[PDB]
Amino acid sequence: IHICLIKNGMDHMYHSFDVPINWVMFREFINSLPGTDIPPWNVMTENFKKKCIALINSK
Numbered sequence: 001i002h003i004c005l006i007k008n009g010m011d012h013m014y015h016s017f018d019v020p021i022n023w024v025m026f027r028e029f030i031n032s033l034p035g036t037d038i039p040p041w042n043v044m045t046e047n048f049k050k051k052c053i054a055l056i057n058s059k
Helices: 002-007 023-032 041-058
Strands: none
Touching: 023 041
16 A cells, blocks of 8 residues: 555655544444455455454454
8 A cells, every 4th residue: 555655646645644443333344345356466355354354353
């Protein structure tokens, strides 16, 4: 994300990252994020969501 912000000239809007507590809302966001297919990211993004949902459910 940092790299693509660097490429799009939004370097300024990466180090300016804060908290948007609402853990039920965080769970909603994460479960609803779509998964891609063509990119090598297809497995990584889903793995990321799986780990995040398992960790938050444990938490």
